[PDB]
């Protein structure tokens, strides 16, 4: 097949599937257990219980298959056909389909534009309804109760038909002429204004015309025949021991059959109305509970307060079918176990237990044993591997050799949660994991468990070596930084090596080379921290890419000379002359990769680990109770602050200070005293070690163990030390957030009961926040992947200069992130010129790798227009150019790489490191750095004082330093005090900004969820719509009035505002579009409409990056940009162009409008529509994909009435049917296959 379609089921098409009619609600005999005739399990209707065997047993073999034994009417075939054979029940009275009635957009409801309540009333047999009135006192549709209908029949015995119940609704749907009605609503939309005439009309017309397009008929809303599910789909299989196990579907079907049969019997029995109406309602209830139970009454299974699961419940939800079965399954050839360290492994291998290897590779072992004549047949090899014969072990070695296996950590936040390794057979039942990869998995050896998967096909074995290999993925996709970095013991050993202390044994001597340094230490003659200077030969390739070695003597240590032996050839040895902790083991690795490449860097990291582990081992590096040295001053400092609070106590007891004043006073003084104590111990630690240089005292950085661990970055930081050896600050409640009685004690002295109890308060919120956040972060990342999947790199180049302007984030005094980091890896939109205008620093469009970044960094440049994903001339995907570069590999992004999923992962993985609540704590401007004042967009004037004053609300304060870059950005309100002006020269901090004080979310992870959902803020700010002086309204009627006053042409626009909302805009001043008349938090829709696509795509990224910047999280703006692009994919036309208020996809509007604009015809104008992630994901071409993610019932119902069609054109729908996803390798295959199709 190549597509899937969904449409209404006509009664005849329903009977088509059925192979028999169910007449009796019986399942099996109760003594023979055989399927009764016409029962739900009937072998005549569906098929035989046993394979190739007849129920009566007369026909038994493959000799005769196609025959229907006259004995029992059974045809001998494969029993699995009971999985595919459907049936049908003939409903005595019509019964409506619940989905077409109870779903939010009631099909029958606005199909006849009748209200839902009245249809529900008619179905309960509580009133009548007219149909096909013709020439009647009444309409064609109406409602009347018992007395009303009583005397109504005598008026017109004919030409007046009024039914009651489901038959009435069906007949109303049948004689209904859709074209006739439709052909009127059109005009009702044209002449009459007053959108109430346009609220449901513009949607009802859509429903009508789509109903006609699908070809299905409305009368099929009411089910005439009820289809049944095959028996094997709802088995009664014996549960052993003894008791049987059935499906609730069986109970529901039994009820339906009982009620239909009783209705038939009563019909023949000629019973009065009340009885038969109660029976009709019972039948409707049973049918609706069988289809979608819970919408009406939640029928229950016997012997339980638990409701019986219906059909619809077996599809929707995280449990059920779609999420739990089709998108994810339990898989063969897999295992699980506890992971542990083996450092002896290479980065590309991992230790795998032999017991697990035997079971996993069982088929391979069987085949290999049978190949070499070691086993006669397959059974013999089975028995051999079962017997644990020695000969098989070698065979195992043969089959595991060069066969990658996928290792997976239980939680999978990003793609690095799964990586392939080369199996290394080991004894025991524990799995050995490589340390360098633990950072990628986010896995400790505290008992965590990991799973293993064995690739089956040759293609999977290649994908586990070229794509998912441990060595082919080093640097993260979210940010260029490498995720493979020495963690705790490696950096500690390296920091111990590179450390230096004066007067070490042999200090100042000279050595021939590093080999002699090693020979000197290992012999006990020279130490490892001596300040010795030796000769080293460093390699530098220069001037044509030709390696040239360099020999010289340097100022170094013995340990650094020993460490130089591991460094690859191409590095400069300036990387090895420092303290050598973790933070720049990272940068050493990064530079090694971006200079020498992948192959040298892999073995470089392996050697770093191999050496650091052994050196940290032989260094000792222990921790004792004396290692934590408390400052002797601490006593006095604590006593001083403790006394300081007594003055405040006397202050409040009198009334000189309020309660809040005194509380803030006490808290401030205690915080300052804590600062003092921590500073005392830190000054006694960092410079603690003092020894004699050449025979005389001198103080140097300390060798204290815990302090070395802090300084190297291997483990706990300074905040840990402050509590280890000093007063551990003051705690915080769940809210109230700080207590006045701090913790005087440090962990070493020991806590008393009260302070420990106080600490548990803050301890709980910390523990609890992690647990419940785990649930919500999954939801966030899941919505993210849902809104992004089908977006794949599909084109080489789009050919647009649009891009976005990349400028450094210079907030306040200094920069939060330089421009190199926000530009590197991307492509220029237009030729950057040297600061001297009209030149060329970079061509039109090129990938800016580190070299262009350095070139830009040297020249004075903080202005680079970078092409972005949001603005791109590509349809149904993104082109490699505008997206830019990124991967574990640092080249331009490949084609066919699905970037939406990896971006959702890049945003979801850090989502677990965020928090649920923020609870922040914390006026002329002072410029810090020497430079030149540069004002931006300011109108000013001179007054009495003679200096300059600002007349405009918006006024940016930049600084053009001696270089020409802008490191200062400050906003100054209306009526400031300008000391210099625009383009002046400031001293080292001259104050040029002065004004007056007055004239007069959560946030965190929930915040990120709010920004990606485009949720309206609590008290929104409103925005001006066009330039011009503002104008006021009539008076305060309800809220207030505000009249827009455009300057030149069309000036009728208007709006209404509450007088309770304060105002900020100037009265008689010109104010351009997108200005803040009112202070407040802005909304994405308003920014998009009043500023443009790029302004809003910059606002989203800049705001969602603050919460991730608060926490130590770094992700390139590219993924957030792709998400933002996916959000605004919808738009609404204005002028209706050449062909048909509507909302459609932007790409389709372009394919329809720009191609015709070329054809010289009229252009169509659209309006960007901004949607949240979940809302943008709600709208998708593929109905299968949408029905999988959320709201299965509604999506399926709507796609059913629409007769919509799905060619699957995408990822999720392809995994649902188990096909090659259209990306990566799947992209390469689909390209060739689709090229030959439809052409």
């Amino acid at each position: 097949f190549d597509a899937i379609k969904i449409a209404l089921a006509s009664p005849d098409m329903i009977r088509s599937w059925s192979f028999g009619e169910v007449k009796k609600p019986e399942t099996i005999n109760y003594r023979t257990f055989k399927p009764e005739r016409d029962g739900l399990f009937c072998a005549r209707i569906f098929g035989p219980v046993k394979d190739y065997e007849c129920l009566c047993g007369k026909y038994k073999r493959l000799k005769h298959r196609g025959v229907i034994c006259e004995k029992c009417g059974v045809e001998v075939t494969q029993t699995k056909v009971r999985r595919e054979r459907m049936g049908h029940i003939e409903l005595a009275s019509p019964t409506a389909h619940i989905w077409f009635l109870k779903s939010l957009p009631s099909r029958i409801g606005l199909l006849l534009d009748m209200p839902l309540r009245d249809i529900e009333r008619v179905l309960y047999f509580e009133s009548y309804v007219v149909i096909e009135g013709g020439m009647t006192n009444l309409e064609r549709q109406q409602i009347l109760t018992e007395e009303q209908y009583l005397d109504a029949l005598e008026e017109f015995g004919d030409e007046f038909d009024a039914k009651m119940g489901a038959e009435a609704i069906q007949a109303l749907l049948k004689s209904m002429d859709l074209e006739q009605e439709c052909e009127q609503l059109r005009e009702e939309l044209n002449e009459t204004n007053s959108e109430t005439k346009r609220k449901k009309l513009t949607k009802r017309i859509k429903l009508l015309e789509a109903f006609v397009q699908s070809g299905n008929k409305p009368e099929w809303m009411i089910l005439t025949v009820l289809p049944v599910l095959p028996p094997d789909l709802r088995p009664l299989v014996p549960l052993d021991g003894g008791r049987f196990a059935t499906s609730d579907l069986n109970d529901l079907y039994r009820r339906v059959i009982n009620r239909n049969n009783r209705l038939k019997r009563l019909l023949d029995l000629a019973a009065p109305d009340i009885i038969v109406r109660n029976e009709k309602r019972m039948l409707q209830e049973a049918v609706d509970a069988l289809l979608d139970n819970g919408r009406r009454g939640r029928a229950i299974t016997g012997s339980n307060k638990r409701p019986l699961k219906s059909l619809a419940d077996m599809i929707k939800g995280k449990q059920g079918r779609f999420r739990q079965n089709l998108l994810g399954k339990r898989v063969d050839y897999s295992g699980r176990s506890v992971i542990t360290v083996g450092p002896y492994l290479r980065l590309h291998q991992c230790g795998l237990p032999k017991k697990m290897a035997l079971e996993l590779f069982k088929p391979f072992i069987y085949g290999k044993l049978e190949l070499r004549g070691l086993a006669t047949t397959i059974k013999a090899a089975k028995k051999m591997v079962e017997r644990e014969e020695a000969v098989v072990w070698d065979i195992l070695d043969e089959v595991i050799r060069e066969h990658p296996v996928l290792l997976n950590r239980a939680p999978t936040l990003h793609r690095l949660g799964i990586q392939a390794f080369e199996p290394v057979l080991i004894e025991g039942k524990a799995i050995q994991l490589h340390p360098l990869v633990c950072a990628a998995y986010n896995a400790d050896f505290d008992g965590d468990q990991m799973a293993v998967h064995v690739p089956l096909t040759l293609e999977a074995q290649l994908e586990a070596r070229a794509l998912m290999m441990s060595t082919n993925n080093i640097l993260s996709p979210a940010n260029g930084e490498p995720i493979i970095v020495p963690s705790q013991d490696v950096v500690l050993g390296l920091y111990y090596m590179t450390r230096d202390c004066v007067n070490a044994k042999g200090e100042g001597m000279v050595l021939t080379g590093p080999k002699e340094a090693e020979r000197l230490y290992r012999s006990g003659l020279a130490s490892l921290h001596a300040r010795v200077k030796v000769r080293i030969t460093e390699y530098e390739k220069d001037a044509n890419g030709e390696l040239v070695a360099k020999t010289s003597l340097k100022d170094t240590t013995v340990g650094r000379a020993i460490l130089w032996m591991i460094v690859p050839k191409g590095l400069p040895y300036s990387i090895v002359n420092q303290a050598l902790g973790k933070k720049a083991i990272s940068k050493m690795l990064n530079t090694c990769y971006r200079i020498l490449g992948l192959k040298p860097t892999v073995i470089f990291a392996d050697q770093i680990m191999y050496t650091g582990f052994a050196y940290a081992a032989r260094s000792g590096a222990s921790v004792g109770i004396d290692d934590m040295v408390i400052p002797e001053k601490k006593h006095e400092i604590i006593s001083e602050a403790e006394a300081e609070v007594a003055e405040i106590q006397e202050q409040f007891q009198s009334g000189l200070v309020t309660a809040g004043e005194r509380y803030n006073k006490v808290i401030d003084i205690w915080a300052a005293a804590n600062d003092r104590v921590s500073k005392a111990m830190m000054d006694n630690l960092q410079t603690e070690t003092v020894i004699n240089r050449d025979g005389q005292e001198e103080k140097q950085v300390s060798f204290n163990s815990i302090y070395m661990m802090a300084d190297s970055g291997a483990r706990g930081s300074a905040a840990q030390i402050r509590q280890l050896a000093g007063m551990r600050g003051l705690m915080a409640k769940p809210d109230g957030s700080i207590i006045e009685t701090p913790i005087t004690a440090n962990f070493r002295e020991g806590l008393n009961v009260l302070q420990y109890f106080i600490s548990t308060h803050g301890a709980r919120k910390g523990l609890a926040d992690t647990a419940l956040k785990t649930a919500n972060s999954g939801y966030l990342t899941r919505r993210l992947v849902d809104v992004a999947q089908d977006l794949v790199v599909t084109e080489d180049d789009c050919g647009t200069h649009e891009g976005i302007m990349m400028t450094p984030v210079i907030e306040g005094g200094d920069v939060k992130e330089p421009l190199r980091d926000r530009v590197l890896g991307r492509v220029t939109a237009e030729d950057v010129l040297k600061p001297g205008t009209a030149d060329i620093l970079v061509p039109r469009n090129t990938l800016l790798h580190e070299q262009w970044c350095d070139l830009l960094e040297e020249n004075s440049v903080d202005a680079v227009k970078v092409r972005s994903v949001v603005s791109c001339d590509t349809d149904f995907g993104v082109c490699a150019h505008c997206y830019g570069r990124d991967l574990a590999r640092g080249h331009i992004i490949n084609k066919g790489e699905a970037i939406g999923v990896i971006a959702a992962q890049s945003i979801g993985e850090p989502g677990t490191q965020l928090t649920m609540r923020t609870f922040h704590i914390g006026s002329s401007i002072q410029v810090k750095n020497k430079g030149s004042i540069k004002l931006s967009n300011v109108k000013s004037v001179v007054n009495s004082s003679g200096k300059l004053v600002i007349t405009s609300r918006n006024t940016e304060l930049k600084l053009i330093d001696e270089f020409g870059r802008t490191k200062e950005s400050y906003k100054v309100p209306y009526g400031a005090v300008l000391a210099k002006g625009d383009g002046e020269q400031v001293a080292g901090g001259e104050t040029v900004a002065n004004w007056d004080p007055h004239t007069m979310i959560t946030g965190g992870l929930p915040r990120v969820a709010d920004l990606f959902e485009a949720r309206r803020p609590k008290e929104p700010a409103i925005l001006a719509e066009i330039s011009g002086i503002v104008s006021f309204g009539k008076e305060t009627k309800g809220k207030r009035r505000l009249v827009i006053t455009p300057v030149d042409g069309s000036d009728p626009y208007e709006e209404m505002i509450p007088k309770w909302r304060q105002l900020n805009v100037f009265e008689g001043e010109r104010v351009e579009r997108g200005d803040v008349i009112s202070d407040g938090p802005e909304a994405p829709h308003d920014i998009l409409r009043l500023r443009g696509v790029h302004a809003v795509t910059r606002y989203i990224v800049n705001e969602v990056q603050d919460v991730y910047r608060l926490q130590g999280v770094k992700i390139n703006d590219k993924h957030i940009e792709v998400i933002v692009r996916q959000m605004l994919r919808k738009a609404t036309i204005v002028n209706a162009g050449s062909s048909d208020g509507e909302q459609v996809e932007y790409s389709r509007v372009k394919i329809a409008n720009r191609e015709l604009e070329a054809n010289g015809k009229v252009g169509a104008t659209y309006s960007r529509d901004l949607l949240g992630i979940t809302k943008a994901s709600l709208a998708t071409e593929s109905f299968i994909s949408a029905a999988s993610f959320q709201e299965t019932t509604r999506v399926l119902t709507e796609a059913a009435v629409a007769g919509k069609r799905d060619e699957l054109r995408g990822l999720k729908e392809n995994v649902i049917v188990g096909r090659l996803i259209p990306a990566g390798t799947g992209y390469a295959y689909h390209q060739d296959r689709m090229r030959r199709r439809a052409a």
């Binding site: 905040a719 915080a732 919120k765 609870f919």
Partner: peptide, 17 residues
């Protein structure tokens, strides 16, 4: 310095003060 949240550092409460 980083929402922890057990003790404050500069702007918010933190896991380590």
């Amino acid at each position: 310095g980083t929402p922890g949240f057990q003790t404050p550092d500069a702007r918010v409460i933190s896991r380590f003060g």
